[PDB]
Ligand binder design. Structure first.
Ligand SMILES: COc1cc(C(=O)N2CCC(N3CCN(C)CC3)CC2)ccc1Nc1ncc2c(n1)N(C)c1ccccc1C(=O)N2C
Length: 260
């Protein structure tokens, strides 16, 4: 249970995406997080990880290959996930939701400005430092959507169905940025209502159909105050070229509303 200087002291998370361990240097005591994969894909991931330098995105410290097992050393977010701050059926107080949303948007503006799309934004991947600062984590699905100032459209299916934008189920090719925006709106919904509005955004999904018919007397929308709900009406728009952009989210009334 050791890699060079570091003792791998406990299991922080697991999955087909390897596992994540708490790592404590015996010399220096600096604690970090290490992702361990039993090993194309990771080469890309590491590459993306090395571009990342922003306070709302998990830092990459470096990596080590040891035969089959790659170790990736990353910022430790000692407050865990946003998922665990969401109370089922209630959400969280609106001012915390707002602050987290602000921080999410800063993170996403940054990724997009370096031409990176995350592609799987959801509360499980939004981690908290010890002062409750939100960090966007897990770049195993991320990719480059802008290079030498030329945009490339995406075609791969990536994501988690309740968070995924409807164009991804319906279009041969799609712009990257409105996909991540959509998912941020699902996150905001989850934060304010403690429940996901649909299993996936298709027309065979009744709850999705009801939203498009504006039945906001139903759950989860009935739990959400009118100011953030109006912003949700701009984000969760089925046509991705009519959907609100981040610069325009920044001008939204609820976004700029002072709160407790
Ligand atoms: C000390 O920091 C963390 C604490 C917790 C957390 O509250 N728990 C609760 C108790 C849990 N169990 C211990 C074992 N026991 C049998 C059951 C209970 C261990 C983890 C969760 C995450 C923590 N920090 C952390 N930072 C960066 C990550 C990352 N996670 N992982 C797991 C990621 C998760 C999702 C997406 C990306 C990451 C990640 O890449 N990093 C770097």
């Amino acid at each position: 249970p050791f890699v060079e200087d570091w003792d791998l002291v406990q299991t922080l998370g697991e999955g087909a995406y390897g596992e994540v361990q708490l790592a404590v240097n015996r010399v220096t005591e600096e604690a970090v997080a290490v992702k361990i994969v039993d090993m194309e894909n990771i080469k890309k991931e590491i590459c993306i990880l090395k571009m990342l330098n922003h306070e709302n995105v998990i830092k990459f410290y470096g990596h080590r290959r040891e035969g089959n097992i790659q170790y990736l050393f990353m910022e430790l977010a000692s407050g865990g996930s946003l998922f665990d701050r969401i109370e089922p059926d209630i959400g969280m107080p609106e001012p915390d939701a707002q602050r987290f949303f602000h921080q999410l948007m800063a993170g996403v503006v940054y990724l997009h400005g370096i031409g990176i799309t995350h592609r799987d934004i959801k509360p499980h991947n939004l981690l908290l430092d010890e002062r409750d600062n939100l960090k966007i984590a897990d770049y195993s699905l991320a990719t480059v959507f802008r290079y030498n100032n030329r945009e490339r459209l995406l075609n791969k299916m990536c994501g988690t169905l309740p968070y995924v934008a409807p164009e991804l189920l319906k279009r041969r090719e799609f712009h990257a940025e409105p996909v991540d925006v959509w998912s941020c709106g699902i996150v905001l919904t989850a934060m304010l209502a403690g429940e996901l509005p649909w299993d996936q955004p298709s027309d065979s999904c009744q709850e999705y159909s009801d939203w498009k018919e504006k039945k906001t007397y139903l759950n989860p929308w009935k739990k959400i105050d009118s100011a953030p709900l109006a912003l949700l009406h701009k984000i969760l728009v089925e046509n991705p070229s009519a959907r609100i952009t981040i610069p325009d989210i920044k001008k939204d009334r609820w976004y700029n509303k002072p709160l407790k």
